[PDB]
Amino acid sequence: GSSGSSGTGEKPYICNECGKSFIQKSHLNRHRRIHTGEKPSGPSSG
Ligand SMILES: [Zn+2]
């Protein structure tokens, strides 16, 4: 785990679907889409 202070620069915008971080709002709001949208074919498996 986190011994102590690891995440010093906690970004404001952070995705929950995958778990990524961003600086701008549009960047995230435009990224999250990747998950939810309209894909032709996908394994949708993990
Ligand atoms: Zn994401």
Question: What was the elucidation method?
Answer: NMR
Q: Which residues pair with 11 in a beta bridge?
A: none
Q: What b/e readout covers 8-26, taking b as 16+ CB neighbours within 10 angstroms?
A: eeeeebeeeeeeeebeeee
| CA 29 to ligand 1 center in whole angstroms | 9
Tell me how far the alpha carbon of residue 25 lies from the centroid of ligand 1, in angstroms: 13
Is the CB of residue 31 less than 8 Å from the CB of residue 22?
A: yes
Amino acid identity of residue 19, one-letter, is G
Per the structure, the complete domain to which residue 13 belongs is given by 1-46
Number of domains present in the structure of the chain? 1
Torsion of CA 11, 14, 20, 23, to 10 degrees: -50
How far is ligand 1, taken at its centre, from the CA of residue 38, in Å? 15
- Burial of residue 32 (CB within 10 Å: 0-12, 13-18, 19+) is middle
Ligand 1 geometric centre to CA of 4 (Å): 26
